[PDB]
Amino acid sequence: MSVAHVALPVPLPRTFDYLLPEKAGCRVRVPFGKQERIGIVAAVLKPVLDDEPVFSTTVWRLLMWAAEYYHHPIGDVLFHALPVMLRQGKPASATRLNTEQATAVGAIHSAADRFSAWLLAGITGSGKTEVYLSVLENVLAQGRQALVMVPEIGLTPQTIARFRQRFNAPVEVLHSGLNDSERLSAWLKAKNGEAAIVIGTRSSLFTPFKDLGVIVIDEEHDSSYKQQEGWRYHARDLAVWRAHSEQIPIILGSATPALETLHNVRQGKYRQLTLSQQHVLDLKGQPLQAGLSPALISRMRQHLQADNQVILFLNRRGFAPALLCHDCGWIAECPRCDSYYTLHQAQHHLRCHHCDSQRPIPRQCPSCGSTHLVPVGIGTEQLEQALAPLLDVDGALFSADFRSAERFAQLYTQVSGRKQGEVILQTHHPEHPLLQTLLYKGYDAFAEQALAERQTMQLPPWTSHVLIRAEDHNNQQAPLFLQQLRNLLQASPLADEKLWVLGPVPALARWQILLQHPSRVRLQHIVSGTLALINTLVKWVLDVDPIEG
Ligand SMILES: [Zn+2]
Ligand SMILES: [Zn+2]
């Protein structure tokens, strides 16, 4: 007896069986209903494209783990990983260094014959790039390949040509401007060991290699590494996973490492290799124009009449604001959980998101009585409408998103080194502890303090998180769905009173629930069991280790 468990590109978390008349990871053409479909054999009844498995051993292992960790259909996951042409069932064929810099290269090179996750931490253009290129030389010397990941926007032809000139070997670049013939042919070149280096973005993570020797991720902290639609994987984590299974080094490069990364360094997980005028304006009691203080505008014009350009920064868009007093600096805090109230002016109430408390919007401040209470964290209201006739550190410090401070610290540290340049911050709380750490001690000091505060609040990366989203035209009832799913999560063996669930709370826009637990592995099992059984079902998607925004 022999029968093949085949995975199909469908949103259902299961394998379909078929018969074998006279291996796993090969593509097959199978009947599916009355039509025909391409599938991939997950393991070995109507009967049934490849000679050899289309995924390498370690890439196959990686995808199998990832599907189960992100709780996404094995079918999608596998077909998402393939070149478009292979999805459709077509054939698999196509007719200088200083002291610090040197030390880094050496350190990595001395452990290059096994797994080792290095954080290359250095201020902007201290030449982290130079380390990448030298480490790659040593790996390419040995005749092993390399994967270089950049953010989506980081594949500039300047960067590309600088690589191409450095290496007398073939470099294969997966930019978004390639067609399907080209993408496939490049995928083959990597698989066959013709391509010494592969440079791409997030999806370049799944490209196969004859002998992969090292992985480089530049701008490790960047958002583009987290896929926001469909299969919500994080390319950085999976790269580190892939490096672990293949037993090769990985280099994570950032001038402003994510706190996740720094935590991993403080613990044994990663090892750090390191490389070596502002005005703070108090908005309190000021007359503002378009949220701008006189002192800023005074400084703006003196830069505009000198014929220079002026950049203003705001807090993305659609994010729900907080409420504070423009005169006295009181902020709307939830009295039960010490957390900032999110303002819902459109529904005429104040709402907590860490717990779920309602409260009316007061038209006067309860701490000093001022009528001047303002919303903070708005720049989608066309600042140009107020600027043509003629920021928001608060938005980052008093957000309902617990990550906002970290995002700001990264921005500020980036733009602090981008003549004599002038940086101006506007805030209602110039003397905020965390802000002060950032401004006077630097990013890593901010991070160390921010990270200890995350432990206090039991937030990531001290805990793991899992979001579950629901969208229903009804606006109501869909939250009942999540309430059903909430209770189904309660009793599942593994509550340990540590599992902490936020009951259905409206998104920062759409409903969702949040799951929290110190153990990553325990929270994966809890989701695995409670998801196994479900019935009704209303949109609904599953986001492990979410970036929220
Ligand atoms: Zn609360
Ligand atoms: Zn007040």
Swiss-Prot record:
The keyword Calcium does not apply. ATP binds at G122, I123, T124, G125, S126, G127, K128, T129. InterPro entries: DEAD/DEAH_box_helicase_dom (IPR011545), Helicase_ATP-bd (IPR014001), Helicase_C-like (IPR001650), P-loop_NTPase (IPR027417), PriA (IPR005259), PriA-like_WH (IPR048949), PriA_3primeBD (IPR041222), PriA_3primeBD_sf (IPR042115). Residues 99-274 are annotated as: Helicase lobe 1. ADP binds at G125, G127, K128, T129, E130, R162. Residues 109-275 form the Helicase ATP-binding domain. Residues 360-467 form the Helicase C-terminal domain. Residues 463-549 are annotated as: CTD. One of its GO terms (cellular component) is primosome complex. ATPase activity is stimulated by single-stranded binding protein (SSB). Zn(2+) 1 binds at C325, C328, C365, C368. Residues 321-375 are annotated as: CRR. Its EC number is 5.6.2.4. Zn(2+) 2 binds at C334, C337, C352, C355. It comes from the Bacteria. Belongs to the helicase family. PriA subfamily. Initiates the restart of stalled replication forks, which reloads the replicative helicase on sites other than the origin of replication. Recognizes and binds to abandoned replication forks and remodels them to uncover a helicase loading site. Promotes assembly of the primosome at these replication forks. Recognizes abandoned replication forks and remodels SSB on ssDNA to uncover a loading site for DnaB. Binds replication fork DNA, has DNA-dependent ATPase activity in the presence of replication fork DNA, restores normal cell growth and SOS induction to E.coli mutant pirA304. This is Replication restart protein PriA. It comes from Klebsiella pneumoniae subsp. pneumoniae (strain ATCC 700721 / MGH 78578).
